């Protein structure tokens, strides 16, 4: 099954965390990485000013069940998601989201697939569009259509 996973990091210099996460994703059992999008930078989301986010999309071939995959991505968040900052470990700065899982629709206490808000997020849709321009959602919507309809700004590469 092809699973599409979003990676986000808001560390100030996130490349080493993101590469650690990618490696960890490639090491998930019963699975392998098919393709990785470019790394994209997106601003904040508040008045003051929070760090830029690095966003990317990964295509993962897997024979795990969806909730088994989530156990692994949450495990990677716990193992790689915090960076030591001087005398203490920082808060989680890595976010792994399952955006799509095959053509499956999932609604459990743990999993909402397709990702619950991805159609509102240029930072999720544009990296996916790079690696899957012809993608169709389980409800029949086409990825291209969502981007055409909302006209989300394109994001700069990191
Ligand atoms: N498709 C999914 N992928 C990952 N976690 C999901 C998904 N759908 C729902 N969740 C739930 O979201 C919670 C974490 O959300 P949050 O902290 O906002 O992180 P993120 O934006 O990375 O999902 C988890 O407890 C997890 O069970
Ligand atoms: Mg997450």
CATH of the domain at 131: 3.30.70.560
E strand or H helix that includes residue 107: strand 106-107
Number of structural domains (the chain) is: 1
Does 92 qualify as catalytic in the annotation? yes
CB 120 within 8 A of CB 146: no
Beta bridge partners of 55: 8, 40
The first and second tokens of residue 104, run together, are 């499956």
Q: How far apart are CA 5 and CA 25, in angstroms?
A: 9
Catalytic residue (choose from 97, 110, 117, 150): 97
Resolution, angstroms, 1 dp: 1.5
114 prior amide bond cis, ω within 30 = yes
Q: Are 3 and 93 in contact (CB under 8 A)?
A: no
- State yes or no: is 97 an active-site residue: yes
Q: Residue 76 sits in which domain range?
A: 1-158
How many other C-beta atoms are found inside a 10 Å radius of the C-beta of residue 8?
A: 20
Q: Give the separation between CA 37 and CA 128, rounded to whole angstroms.
A: 7
Choose which residue among 5, 82, 110 to substitute to test ligand 1 binding: the one with the highest number of ligand atoms within 8 A of its C-beta: 110
Ligand 1 within 6 A of CB of 7: no
Nearest Cα to 124, choosing from 32, 65, 55?
55
């Amino acid at each position: 099954t092809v699973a599409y996973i979003a990676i986000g990091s808001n560390l100030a210099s996130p490349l080493e965390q993101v590469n650690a996460a990618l490696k960890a994703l490639g090491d998930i059992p019963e699975s392998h990485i098919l393709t990785v999008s470019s790394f994209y930078r997106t601003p904040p989301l508040g008045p003051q000013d929070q760090p830029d986010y690095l966003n990317a999309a990964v295509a993962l071939e897997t024979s795990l069940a969806p909730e088994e995959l989530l156990n692994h991505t949450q495990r990677i968040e716990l193992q790689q998601g915090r960076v030591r900052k001087a005398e203490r470990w920082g808060p989680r700065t890595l976010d792994l989201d399952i955006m799509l899982f095959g053509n499956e629709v999932i609604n459990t206490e743990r999993l909402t697939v397709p990702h619950y808000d991805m159609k509102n997020r240029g930072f999720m849709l544009w990296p996916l569009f790079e690696i899957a321009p012809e993608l169709v959602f389980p409800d029949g919507e086409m990825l291209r259509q969502i981007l055409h309809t909302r006209a989300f700004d394109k994001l700069n590469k990191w």
